[PDB]
Structure formats: C-alpha cells, structure tokens
Amino acid sequence: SYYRPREEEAIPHPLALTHKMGWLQLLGRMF
C-alpha cells in the first residue's frame, strides 16, 4: 500500500475519474 490523499473509493463519485483519472488507472483495486 501507499499514501495517496485523494484515495477515495466511491464508484459514482467525480473524485478524479471525470477530470483526468490520474491514479485509478494504476490503483485498479476499488473500481
């Protein structure tokens, strides 16, 4: 695991997915 402050889990949420999706692509575990 790693420190990432933005690291929320909510699939419906615009947490990063809509703006640029910078870290979901390397994370993959929650979505």
Short mmCIF file of N, CA and C in Angstrom, two decimals:
data_model
loop_
_atom_site.label_atom_id
_atom_site.label_comp_id
_atom_site.label_asym_id
_atom_site.label_seq_id
_atom_site.Cartn_x
_atom_site.Cartn_y
_atom_site.Cartn_z
N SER A 1 0.84 -1.23 0.00
CA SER A 1 0.00 0.00 0.00
C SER A 1 0.87 1.27 0.00
N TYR A 2 0.27 2.42 -0.31
CA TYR A 2 0.94 3.73 -0.41
C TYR A 2 0.06 4.88 0.10
N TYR A 3 0.68 5.97 0.57
CA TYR A 3 -0.02 7.22 0.86
C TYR A 3 -0.41 7.93 -0.45
N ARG A 4 -1.72 8.15 -0.63
CA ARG A 4 -2.33 8.97 -1.65
C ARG A 4 -3.53 9.68 -0.98
N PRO A 5 -3.53 11.02 -0.82
CA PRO A 5 -4.56 11.70 -0.02
C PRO A 5 -5.96 11.64 -0.65
N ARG A 6 -6.02 11.79 -1.98
CA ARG A 6 -7.22 11.73 -2.84
C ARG A 6 -7.89 10.34 -2.94
N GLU A 7 -7.32 9.30 -2.32
CA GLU A 7 -7.63 7.86 -2.47
C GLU A 7 -8.98 7.39 -1.88
N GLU A 8 -10.05 8.08 -2.26
CA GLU A 8 -11.44 7.70 -2.05
C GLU A 8 -11.86 6.52 -2.95
N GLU A 9 -12.94 5.86 -2.56
CA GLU A 9 -13.39 4.57 -3.11
C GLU A 9 -14.74 4.58 -3.86
N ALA A 10 -15.51 5.68 -3.78
CA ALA A 10 -16.89 5.72 -4.25
C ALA A 10 -16.99 5.74 -5.80
N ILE A 11 -17.39 4.62 -6.40
CA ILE A 11 -17.56 4.44 -7.86
C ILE A 11 -18.41 5.52 -8.57
N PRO A 12 -19.61 5.91 -8.07
CA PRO A 12 -20.41 7.01 -8.63
C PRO A 12 -19.75 8.40 -8.57
N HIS A 13 -18.72 8.58 -7.75
CA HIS A 13 -18.18 9.89 -7.40
C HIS A 13 -17.18 10.49 -8.40
N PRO A 14 -17.25 11.81 -8.71
CA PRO A 14 -16.27 12.52 -9.54
C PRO A 14 -14.95 12.83 -8.80
N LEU A 15 -14.41 11.87 -8.03
CA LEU A 15 -13.22 12.06 -7.17
C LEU A 15 -11.94 12.35 -7.98
N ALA A 16 -11.84 11.74 -9.17
CA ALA A 16 -10.84 12.04 -10.21
C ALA A 16 -11.24 11.54 -11.62
N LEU A 17 -12.12 10.53 -11.69
CA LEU A 17 -12.50 9.78 -12.90
C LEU A 17 -12.94 10.67 -14.08
N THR A 18 -13.57 11.81 -13.77
CA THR A 18 -14.15 12.71 -14.79
C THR A 18 -13.19 13.81 -15.27
N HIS A 19 -12.21 14.19 -14.43
CA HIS A 19 -11.29 15.31 -14.69
C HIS A 19 -10.06 14.88 -15.50
N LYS A 20 -9.42 13.77 -15.07
CA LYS A 20 -8.20 13.21 -15.68
C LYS A 20 -7.90 11.74 -15.36
N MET A 21 -8.49 11.17 -14.29
CA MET A 21 -8.33 9.75 -13.88
C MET A 21 -6.86 9.33 -13.70
N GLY A 22 -6.07 10.17 -13.01
CA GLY A 22 -4.61 10.03 -12.94
C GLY A 22 -4.10 8.82 -12.16
N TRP A 23 -4.84 8.38 -11.13
CA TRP A 23 -4.37 7.35 -10.18
C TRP A 23 -5.28 6.12 -10.07
N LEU A 24 -6.52 6.16 -10.57
CA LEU A 24 -7.38 4.95 -10.64
C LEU A 24 -6.79 3.92 -11.60
N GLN A 25 -6.20 4.41 -12.69
CA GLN A 25 -5.53 3.58 -13.71
C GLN A 25 -4.39 2.70 -13.13
N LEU A 26 -3.55 3.24 -12.23
CA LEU A 26 -2.50 2.45 -11.55
C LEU A 26 -3.01 1.70 -10.30
N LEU A 27 -4.05 2.22 -9.63
CA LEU A 27 -4.65 1.63 -8.43
C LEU A 27 -5.46 0.36 -8.73
N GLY A 28 -6.53 0.48 -9.53
CA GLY A 28 -7.41 -0.60 -10.01
C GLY A 28 -8.23 -1.39 -8.96
N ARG A 29 -7.88 -1.31 -7.66
CA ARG A 29 -8.42 -2.20 -6.61
C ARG A 29 -9.85 -1.89 -6.14
N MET A 30 -10.24 -0.61 -6.15
CA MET A 30 -11.52 -0.13 -5.57
C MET A 30 -12.65 0.13 -6.60
N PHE A 31 -12.35 0.06 -7.91
CA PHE A 31 -13.24 0.49 -9.00
C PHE A 31 -13.35 -0.57 -10.12
#
